[PDB]
Amino acid sequence: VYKFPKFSKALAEDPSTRRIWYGIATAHDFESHDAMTESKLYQKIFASHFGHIAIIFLWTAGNLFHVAWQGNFEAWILNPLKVRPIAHAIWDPHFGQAAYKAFLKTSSPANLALSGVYEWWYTIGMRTNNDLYQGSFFLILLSSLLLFAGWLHLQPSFRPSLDWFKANEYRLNHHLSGLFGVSSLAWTGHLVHVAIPESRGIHVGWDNFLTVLPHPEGLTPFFSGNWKAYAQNPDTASHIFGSGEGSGTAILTFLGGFHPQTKSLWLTDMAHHHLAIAVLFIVAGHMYRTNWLIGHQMKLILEAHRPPGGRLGIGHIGLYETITNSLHFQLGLALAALGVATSLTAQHMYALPPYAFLASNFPTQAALYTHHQYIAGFLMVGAFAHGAIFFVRDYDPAVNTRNGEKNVLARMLEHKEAIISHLSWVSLFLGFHTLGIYVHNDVVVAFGQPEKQILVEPLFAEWIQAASGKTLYNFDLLLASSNSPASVASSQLWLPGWLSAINDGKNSLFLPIGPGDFLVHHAIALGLHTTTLILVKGALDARGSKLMPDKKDFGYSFPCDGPGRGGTCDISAWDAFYLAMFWMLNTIGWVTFYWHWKHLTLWQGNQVQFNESSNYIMGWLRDYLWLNSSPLINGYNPFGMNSLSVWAWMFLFGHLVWATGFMFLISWRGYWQELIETIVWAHERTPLANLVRWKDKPVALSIVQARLVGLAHFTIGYVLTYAAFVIASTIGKLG
Amino acid sequence: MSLDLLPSFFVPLVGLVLPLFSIIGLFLYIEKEN
């Protein structure tokens, strides 16, 4: 009953099971630990970062090793459009003979790989199960390096100080230039040297790379300035990927669009992209001042940025010390940027597939988009939660105020009511009218008169598609016109490739849109606005409100303030995160439902099914869920089973976890404490069991813990059931 | 010993033995005193 929460003496003195539960959930909140200083905080965070990167590299190495050992990578190379990639083998003693037979792939039961790693590794120039093994070996070596570094930087003479940790200019210069630019430069080097010849049949391994010229002229044009030579003779339109037939000699080109065979971006396009990004980031990494008297001091930049007329208060004067001294502000900024970035990855890796033969891998396309959108929602909610935490525990009004006037951040708490009221107005506006149009379509179609539907053509979005060259909406605007200056400017660089790809019905590049797209985009906007409303309200109201003008004194996460003053359930800022998680899950569900139904109709060919039935709710319920759930639920029946049996089991498992979350959310404490007391009496008053007694007094889960557990069940069930549905439906419908 | 015997050697090992020893260690640690 002691010594487990070593970091908290208050918990270690708890005589109940709450100590164990809270010991888990407070282990990473280093700022709240006993005998805590800032130096130890930054050092522990640094070591934890090292361990985390080691974990990531070990996970990647495991994926590589299991593809190399139990996969069919080599067979998939020779026939990427017919051979289904294998993730890893299965050894489960609970299998019957039927399950073994159904999951049997080649030599052993195995799982199909939906991560798209086969296409990614094939694109970057891997052709052998020994190339994957080398990658796994190297990644385990890198993990060992990172673990050694993490141990080393906790040693006495190697523990960095607060000044080093808060040295913003040095870290920015190095991160930008070194990390981004130099990693892009090295990736361009690999892309060219290995990937470009490997796509043309020439093997460039760790033996013949110092003697195989990536370009026939060989670094002469680069130093000579004749950089056009690297773009001459690109890959033809009859080039077979991985073979020298119809190949070229160029290494950096503009082509635009996709490879005619793999239906993916040109490797020479991506090498040029990464070279340009490398140059730009290396240049941008010299901005801030270091030991050589030139550069920028960001404190001065922030302080000097006050509009002269005066509408942002005193400007950004106090922001430097605010951000530097708070790890939650930086964490929130990083999480918001990462969420936007992974939303970008999801939205671009389906419209512009970058890996060979990934466009025809429909289950992996759906899985990748869903995975990245869910990660995006999680990251955004985390960014807002950490902003709220910064408000609660790191924000100092004195730093952000100069002689009564407030800086740009402190002024966000002055018109907080205006911000929240207008977020509420936008949410109500969008919800009222999107639901009104959807229900109008529902009722009108149900009454057998679909012509009375309200169908709004998304002209604004179709205008953008025409601006990028789509000649489908008869707009003749910028790139849909051959005479506009936008078209004449790039008529010789990348329009022929771009136009040939955007004006193609088999791509996902700028999918044609209609009224259903309009309505679902408005639903998405409503979801985004409502999630933002909840999170922003929790962040701004974190330090106090009218119901609790001292909420900052109770911390970020506390159960309530009691039944007084009318009742104060879910009044903390943590509860705002807890409520906004449901809205994030709902919004990501809407986004992924829209994407998956649109792409299922596109792949099956019945795009008229979406364009007609997507305007009313029953259309969704009947033609997406009810229609495509048939292959999934018949993964095992009283007659047999298929390789989709695991997905049906996961479907039911997700439903069960969802409803257990419903348990933990609807039923609150107090009802579970008295029942536990009855159980305690029963155990204490029964023979043959009195010999065994608990060391920690069994008590019901706390209010905040119960909310967390219900949210965890809700989210896990949500994710599992939707993953099972999307994967099984795609597999069982599209062969 | 072939490579295909490794799943049958490791999956029971990990998925049953590692839980047992991990539970023993974690229970002992969280039930300690001072």
Partner: peptide, 30 residues
């Protein structure tokens, strides 16, 4: 198909990475 030697040495290297992990884990304290 990878050999027994390839898998064996990868397992041995994985063990070394495990001993480095507990050293980091124990150094991050109880």
């Amino acid at each position: 198909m990878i050999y027994d030697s390839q898998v064996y040495i990868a397992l041995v290297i994985a063990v070394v990475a495990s001993v480095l992990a507990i050293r980091l884990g124990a150094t991050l304290y109880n």
